[PDB]
Structure formats: structure tokens, C-alpha cells
């Protein structure tokens, strides 16, 4: 695991380094997939006459 | 507004309003009566009117008087919008009772004859879904406008 992975013996001590993520969020940028779903009620309330 | 001509009395014995060949006469008014009262149609005749209706004078009175740019994506935000979004639900409820009441009810009271005596604009289908398409327009118009000018702003 010296070669392969990192997990190398310093002193007395392993350091595997940080798995953790960014997460990027804004989460309001559904914004034309949220205005596209609108579009569809409305569409399937309308259209057939 | 009409307009008129007046007649000779030299065609007492003819045919006064001497109309001919064509099949446009019965059209744009009956002589009405309280206008045959008075000299028609033995004085004076009436007579068709129709514009000279032309482009660039329709829509130049259409899209001038009628019109409204930046109005286009506005709000008119909340304080009111979610406030008469509390306005309809709540005797639409009451309506909804009442919507309980006439099909629960469901009697054989020869029921093409119970139906035509109580017509009154009235609960099952007049006074129902005309709210629903009410609430449908004014929140999706709403709200698909809030999505846009999140896209189109930042």
C-alpha cells in the first residue's frame, strides 16, 4: 500500500489525504428546467379542444 | 349612424327605391320601425355603408392604443398575489360542500326534470372549475415569470 496507494509510514504516522468533496451548490439554477416544467401543465391542460 | 336619399314623387306609379339586379339589400338593417315610422319609405330611402378599411391605419390603431412593453414581465409581487391566493380557496370550500351536497344526493326524482327545474348559475359544474382556471392562470403567470427573470437578470 506504500507503492500502490499513499498510506506512508512518516513518523509512526499515516496520512491519507482528504476524500471530501467541494459541493458546488446553488440549487435555484433549476431555473429553466423549473420553467420548463410549468410550461407542460399548462400545455396539457390547453391544447386538446 | 345611417344615411339616407331622399326620393322623387314622380314614380308614384313606379316602383320608388328602384332597385335592380343584385341580392345585397336584405342585408345591413330591416327598414326598422321606428325609423319607417317617419319618411321611410315614401319620402326619403337608406342606403349601405361599409369602410374604406385599410392597413397600416388597423395596426397602427391596434398596436398604439392597446400595448404594454416592460409591463410584459412584472410582478405585482406577493403581498397581494399569495393574499388573493387565500381569497378564492376559501369559498371554494364552501362551494366544494356544496358540490357534496347535490351528488351525494342522487335521487331518482326523474332526474332530467330535477336537474332543469333548479338551473341558477349555479354549484356543480357553473359556479365549480371556472375558480380552478382562475387559480391555474394567475399562479403559473406568476411564477413562470419569477423563474425567467432569474435567468434573464444574473
Redesign the interface.
Known amino acids: 500500500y506504500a507503492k500502490k496507494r499513499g498510506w506512508v509510514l512518516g513518523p509512526n504516522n499515516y496520512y491519507s489525504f482528504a476524500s471530501q468533496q467541494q459541493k458546488p451548490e446553488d440549487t435555484?439554477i433549476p431555473?429553466?428546467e423549473?420553467?420548463k416544467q410549468?410550461?407542460e401543465?399548462?400545455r396539457q391542460?390547453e391544447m386538446i379542444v | 349612424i345611417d344615411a339616407f336619399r331622399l326620393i322623387n314623387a314622380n314614380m308614384m306609379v313606379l316602383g320608388h327605391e328602384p332597385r335592380q339586379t343584385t341580392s345585397n339589400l336584405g342585408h345591413l338593417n330591416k327598414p326598422s320601425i321606428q325609423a319607417l315610422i317617419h319618411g321611410l319609405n315614401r319620402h326619403y330611402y337608406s342606403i349601405t355603408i361599409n369602410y374604406r378599411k385599410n392597413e397600416l391605419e388597423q395596426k397602427m390603431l391596434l398596436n398604439l392604443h392597446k400595448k404594454s412593453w416592460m409591463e410584459g414581465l412584472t410582478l405585482q409581487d406577493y403581498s397581494e398575489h399569495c393574499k388573493h391566493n387565500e381569497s378564492v380557496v376559501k369559498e371554494m370550500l364552501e362551494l366544494a360542500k356544496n358540490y357534496n351536497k347535490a351528488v351525494e344526493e342522487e335521487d331518482k326524482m326523474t332526474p332530467e326534470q330535477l336537474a332543469i327545474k333548479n338551473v341558477g348559475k349555479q354549484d356543480p359544474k357553473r359556479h365549480l372549475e371556472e375558480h380552478v382556471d382562475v387559480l391555474m392562470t394567475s399562479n403559473i403567470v406568476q411564477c413562470l415569470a419569477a423563474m425567467l427573470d432569474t435567468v434573464v437578470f444574473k
Do not use: D, K, M
Open positions: 435555484t431555473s429553466t423549473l420553467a410549468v410550461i401543465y399548462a391542460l
